[PDB]
């Protein structure tokens, strides 16, 4: 599968997502951004079935933006993830389920704390310090189980991810073409344009 990683440090949540989009024998694109901003402080990454993936991300984005406008308020990260979980949980028992896994990284301005939610296509949600979807988790959970620390700074988090991406670029069979990294904190969502060699 594609690489979808997330790590929650002291005051931010960082999401790293592979850039490759491959079909059969060809890597069609190497600059794919597997993410959608749901609200100024909530970001969602996704991996899964070819078309379902974006259709789901955009459908969720549309709903959150609608709520924001209607209520002139921003739902908390926990609120948004519960909404996403329910959508997936409905889907799994529908005619053709959405085959999409997501990571929701958000900064809760009311609690002043970053939050990372991992949710699979079945609607299985869990809140974690770090998470991953696909085969990635098989090399990153133990890596992070070892190197991760609660009080880490955003900069330490990025170095921690770099350690993850290097492990993946070493042992994973596929060429996922690097990752796009985004930070979610009290000031919003920004993209680290320099990870191709940080």
């Amino acid at each position: 599968m594609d690489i979808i990683l997330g790590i929650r440090v002291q005051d931010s949540v960082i999401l790293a997502s592979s850039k490759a989009v491959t079909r059969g024998i060809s890597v069609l694109k190497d600059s794919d951004d597997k993410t959608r901003q749901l609200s100024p402080h909530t970001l969602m990454s996704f991996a899964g079935e070819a078309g379902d993936t974006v259709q789901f991300a955009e459908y969720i984005q549309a709903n959150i933006q609608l709520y924001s406008i209607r209520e002139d308020y921003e739902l908390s990260p926990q609120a948004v993830s519960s909404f996403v979980r329910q959508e997936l949980a409905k889907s799994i028992r529908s005619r053709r389920p959405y085959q999409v896994n997501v990571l929701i990284g958000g900064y809760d301005k009311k609690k002043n704390k970053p939050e990372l939610y991992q949710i699979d296509y079945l609607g299985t949600k869990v809140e974690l310090p770090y998470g991953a979807h696909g085969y990635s988790g098989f090399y990153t959970f133990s890596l992070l189980d070892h190197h991760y620390r609660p009080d880490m700074t955003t900069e330490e988090g990025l170095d921690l991810l770099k350690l993850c991406v290097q492990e993946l670029e070493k042992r994973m069979p596929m060429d996922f073409k690097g990752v796009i990294v985004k930070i979610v904190d009290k000031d919003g969502i920004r993209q680290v344009d320099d990870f191709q060699a940080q």
């Binding site: 209520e71 308020y73 739902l75 908390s76 926990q78 609120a79 519960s82 909404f83 329910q86 009311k110």
Partner: protein
């Protein structure tokens, strides 16, 4: 055909008014008075039980104050049965929200949904509107204590102090006269009772003719608490405030 017997409950008068809504409001104006007062540390809901008897069981009775949530309650002025239909759907909407977002429903979202249901009976369906007006008392972490009001038209507004039902004109003037932004729950409790006391179409204002409720954030805790006063409790607060 049937057309012959259709009252057409959803049409405009030549003046641009909705007949049924206006008539439903007229109905509401004869209902026991209900008052809502918002303070810095809480909200007070009080209502006068229209018509009573020696044999009426007041301990098991409730015709005006209903709990919609653990953080929201309403005072009713109008057809009790109609109110119950709306109250129940309001309770369901609150739980759907909780199940969806894992957060209690913000007071206004719930009030707006209920008001929207009412608005519908106003524009389509050919059915009579609900002869009910509500005073919502609730609390959420975005606006704190809030007081709203909705009537047959589906329109709703926020207030510091408001009344619905009979003699609201007199009640409003009295409220607009003694209310003060920095009031306190206890001040409000007293203001509410005094107002009802001067607007009642009855001889005196006894406890068996009242329903009281308060939504406070008990200092010794940190959470919000709703309290629908019990007969005895009303009798007490009645003597204390000097109405005996």
């Amino acid at each position: 055909g049937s057309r012959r017997y259709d009252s057409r409950t959803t049409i405009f008068s030549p003046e641009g008014r909705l007949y049924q809504v206006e008539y439903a409001l007229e109905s509401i104006s004869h209902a026991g008075t209900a008052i809502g007062i918002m303070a810095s540390d809480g909200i007070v809901l009080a209502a006068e039980r229209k018509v009573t008897s020696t044999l009426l069981e007041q301990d098991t009775s409730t015709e005006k104050l209903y709990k919609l949530n653990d953080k929201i309650a309403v005072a009713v002025a109008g057809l009790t049965a109609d109110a119950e239909i709306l109250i129940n759907t309001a309770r369901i909407h609150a739980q759907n929200y909780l199940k969806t977002y894992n957060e209690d429903i913000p007071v206004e979202i719930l009030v707006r949904r209920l008001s929207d249901i009412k608005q519908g009976y106003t524009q389509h369906g050919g059915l009579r509107p609900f002869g009910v007006s509500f005073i919502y008392a609730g609390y959420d972490d975005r606006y704190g204590y809030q007081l709203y009001t909705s009537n047959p038209s589906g329109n709703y507004t926020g207030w510091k102090a408001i009344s619905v039902g009979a003699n609201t004109s007199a009640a409003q003037t009295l409220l607009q006269m003694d209310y003060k932004d920095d009031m306190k729950v206890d001040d409000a409790i007293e203001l509410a009772l005094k107002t009802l006391s001067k607007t009642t179409d009855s001889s005196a204002l006894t406890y068996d003719r009242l329903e009281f409720a308060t939504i406070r954030k008990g200092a010794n805790d940190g959470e919000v608490y709703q309290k629908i006063f019990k007969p005895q409790e009303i009798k007490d607060i009645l003597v204390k405030t000097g109405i005996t």
